[PDB]
Every structure is written in C-alpha cells, then in structure tokens.
Amino acid sequence: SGALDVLQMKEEDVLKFLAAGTHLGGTNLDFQMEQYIYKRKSDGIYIINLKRTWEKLLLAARAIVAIENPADVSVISSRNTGQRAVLKFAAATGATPIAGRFTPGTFTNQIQAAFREPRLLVVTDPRADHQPLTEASYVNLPTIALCNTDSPLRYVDIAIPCNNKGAHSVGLMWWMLAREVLRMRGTISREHPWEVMPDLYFYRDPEEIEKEEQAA
C-alpha cells in the first residue's frame, strides 16, 4: 500500500483474519520477526499485527504481478495444509505448482525430467520448505515466504507475517494472495467480492471427507 485508499484493509478482510486466526502466531519468536509482532500476551502467544501482514501481502502481490510470464512463478508446498491451496493458486494464476515432495536438484541439476528454471519463488513455510530455499540461493531466485513468528528468514526477500500452522489460515492467505494478484492485474473488479470463496483453498482431511460425504 502506497497510502492508497483503494488498497487499504477493509472490514471483511479483518473479519476473515480473525475467523482463521492469522493474528494468533506461534509461541517462539525469531528476533528478525520481532518487527512484525504487536505485543506478547500473558500466557505466551505472540500477536501478529494485521496491518503489517496486509502491507507485506500487497508487496508480495506487487512482486508476483511484476513477473511478466505467469508460469515463471513457482509455488511449492510440502505439508498437507497448503497442498490443495497451492493447486488452487495455480488455477487462479497459472503459476507452476509443486505439491508433495520437492525433489532435490530440481533447480540445480540440469539433466533431469523435473528440472525447471523459475524467476520468482513463493514458499508456504520456510521451516518445512528449506530445500527450495537452498536451491533458490543457488540459482538466484527471489523468495516469497508465508512466515510465522518462529520462522528463520534466511534467503527470503518478502516475509509475510501470518499464522501458517492452521489449514484455515493457510487457505485464507493463499486465497487473498490470489485475489490480490488478480485484482492487481485487473482481470477482476476490486469493488465486487470475488466469486471464489476461500473455503475452496482448505485442506480436506479424509476423515472429514467421509463425514461430509455422509451428510449429503
């Protein structure tokens, strides 16, 4: 946000952030992430400032939009909570998704079936996805990372302070990132709400799949 009244955080976004629990960070704290916290509460939980989260999300969306080829953005998730969302993010944008195992040597070993050369890297979790951070360090790739309070900031350029442990928070962050990228490009109107609701981006958890197929 360049102090633009269009790009400010609205009431519905704040309600979504409170509903998922993005303000509820981790319990540990990395010293480089202390700039993005609000206060330490009594029982130990670190509160994530939502305005800084909005500003870093806008910075990340601006970085993604500035990549001309939409396939040059690589979006990787290793753990389950981000997986579907990453695939859904591809359906929003066209960026190249890696869900599941990230094979080492993807960005460095040129003679491979899964060798690919991106231009911008977007990472669900810097703690879980350390290997693509190392490869991006080797092959000159800037990094977007959805960082929590206890998240190392080695080889990341834009750290988005948010809760990334819960499935709802991860899905919400990916959905608002996709919505902001599509609004920034201009393919969807900023005034009307997006027709894709954020519940499309959440983890399925097959026992809950059984419970939901039961109630049909």
């Binding site: 001309e68 040059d72 040129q110 092959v139 000159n140």
Partner: protein, 218 residues
C-alpha cells in the same frame, strides 16, 4: 550438434545474448560448457598445470586414477581453473577443461602510474586465500612482467595481466591450494570496489525478463 537444456543456453544458441559480460552482469550460473565455447571459441587456449596419479582405495584394491589440474584462459580477458579425477588421463584432462570452462571469471585490469593506452596490471593489491596458501597481487610498472612462481605466472599470463608483483605465504608446494588461491585473488581483483565504480547502477532488464516472449515458444 548442441541441444541446449537451460533457458540461458537456448538464448546463447540464438542471437538474443551477444556478449558474455551480460551473463556476468547479472551473475547468472553458466551450467553449460557450450556457452563459453560459443562466445570465446578458438581464443581459449588450455594449459595442463599438473597430472597427479593417485591410488583409489576400494575393497577390490588399490587402483590408479589420474587427477588433472588444468588452467584454461582467454588472453587479455578471462581464466578458469579445473580439477578432475578420472580413470584415463585424457578423460581427466577433458573433464578438467570442462570444469574450468564452467568456472570462467572476468579479471579487472588497471594502470600502475598514469593511464595511457590499454590496461596491463592488477588495479589494486589483492589477496587470495586457500588452505593456508596466501597469494598477494601488487600492481607493477609497465614492462616488468609477471614476477611470481611458475603456476601463478601461468594463471596471470592466461588472464592477460601483462605484469604483476606477487608474494606467497604458506605451504605453496601443494599445487591445488596454490592455484585456487591465485584464482581467488584474480576473482577479488574484480570483486573489489574502487572510487571509479561509485555511480549508482541503473538496472538493465534481465536476460530472462527481456526475452521471456521468445522463451514462451520454447
């Protein structure tokens, strides 16, 4: 026939990238030897610094492989240093040549006294360190020549440095650390910041960013 794998190799194969310095401008990794083969070509000469035969240990036994230390160099321009251990000596030599082609770095050249003509010497006194081996390069007046041990003389002659005073420290008997320390000193010649390079850098568009429309089709 060369069939490139990387996007950089695809651009080098076509006429999108005209010079090697552009690839050195954005510090992109050169992962193919054919890029250096295409840009420099016949101007690259090779000089095998050393062949050491060594006995590889295996449960089958002590079997011999040869280790090649090769310094490749484009005169008044570039050097590369390659180390390769292999079964046959020719295979080790060509592997070291390939690994030295992948490590081609530019060297900055300056003047000792007043700036007349082409640069001939190292711009400022620099240092390269490798395993207790210290190599120090000092600017020299024109016409002096390289005053060094034979291996750094080889490297500085292939760098196009016409003249340079040298001082070494440590166990210089081992050739690998000595050559790598000289190579590191050559890299820090250009990595050094001087009052000449004080202008704010205007950012030219990246080669992947400029020719992304051509790279959509491939």
């Amino acid at each position: 026939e060369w069939m490139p794998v990387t996007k950089l190799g695809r651009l080098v194969k076509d006429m999108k990238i005209k010079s090697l310095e552009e690839i050195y401008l954005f510090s992109l990794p050169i992962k193919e030897s054919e890029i250096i083969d295409f840009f420099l070509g016949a101007s690259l000469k090779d000089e095998v610094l050393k062949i050491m035969p060594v006995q590889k240990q295996t449960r089958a036994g002590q079997r011999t492989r040869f280790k090649a230390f090769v310094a490749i160099g484009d005169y008044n321009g570039h050097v590369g240093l390659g180390v390769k251990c292999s079964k046959e000596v020719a295979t080790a030599i060509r592997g070291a040549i390939i690994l030295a082609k992948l490590s081609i770095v530019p060297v900055r050249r300056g003047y000792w006294g007043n700036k007349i003509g082409k640069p001939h010497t190292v711009p400022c006194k620099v240092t390269g360190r490798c395993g207790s081996v210290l190599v120090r390069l000092i600017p020299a007046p024109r016409g002096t020549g390289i005053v060094s041990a034979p291996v750094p003389k080889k490297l500085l002659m292939m760098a196009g440095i016409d003249d340079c005073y040298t001082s070494a420290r440590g166990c210089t008997a081992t050739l690998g650390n000595f050559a790598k320390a000289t190579f590191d000193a050559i890299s820090k010649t250009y990595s050094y910041l001087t009052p000449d390079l004080w202008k704010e850098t205007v950012f030219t568009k990246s080669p992947y960013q400029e020719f992304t429309d051509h790279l959509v089709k491939t």
